């Protein structure tokens, strides 16, 4: 079923009861490259992780970024306002509303 895919010569091989048969030295070349690519691999799967790992660190020396501000400014308002006639008014009044 696997060999179903690939832009490969569906000739060059042949199957049988315990194994596939394959011609040479190209496919041979392919594999080799492949071979190196796995030495990397885990290695390759590590990297992204590592990468990615720090990529979240930046967002943190980072996520928080705004939630603070929000908190920051938000308080300041109040400190200013709470002493304002109009705002006290709204306050006593805010309840009668619906």
């Amino acid at each position: 079923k696997l060999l179903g895919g690939g832009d490969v010569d569906h000739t060059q091989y042949a199957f049988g009861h315990t194994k596939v048969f394959f011609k040479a030295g190209l496919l041979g070349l392919l594999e080799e490259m492949r071979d190196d690519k796995l030495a990397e691999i885990i290695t390759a799967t590590q990297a992204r992780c590592r990468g990615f790992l720090m990529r979240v660190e930046y967002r943190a020396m980072v996520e928080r970024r705004e939630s603070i501000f929000c908190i920051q400014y938000n308080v300041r308002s109040f400190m200013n306002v709470k002493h304002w006639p109009w705002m006290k008014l709204f306050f006593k009044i805010k309840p009668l509303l619906k």
Binding site: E63, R64, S67, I68, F69, C70, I71, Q72, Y73, N74, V75, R76, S77, F78, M79, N80, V81, K82, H83, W84, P85, W86, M87, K88, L89, F90, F91, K92, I93, K94
Partner: protein, 145 residues
Amino acid sequence: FDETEIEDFKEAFTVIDQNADGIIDKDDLRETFAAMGRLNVKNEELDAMIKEASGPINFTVFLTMFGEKLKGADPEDVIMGAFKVLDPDGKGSIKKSFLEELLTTGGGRFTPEEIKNMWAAFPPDVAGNVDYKNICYVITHGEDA
């Protein structure tokens, strides 16, 4: 400025502008204060409110004056968003010393002296960082509830 907050300022502008012409003059300020119970509202208080504007208080002059004083104003749902990220397990009000350390050590706006002023009218729980939610209420609408 979200649009419902601008509609709340339009409703407050209509309750203070009792002549309904679109410009709050000093007579509107005095008659709104007298209808709230202020029989002794001095003319110097009305003149200090008008001295914060460069022109007549129409709806866009009232919005720009409130914008320039509320440049860090945050709605209650975004303050509770940030406090749910500070208490990510939900329900519990966060510790007093955790909010003092995280305000200081992250930002200059969270410096201590300011943290003593935060505890000072925002009471204990609020100040301490244990309760939560009452501080979001009084940051969007001041004074004791």
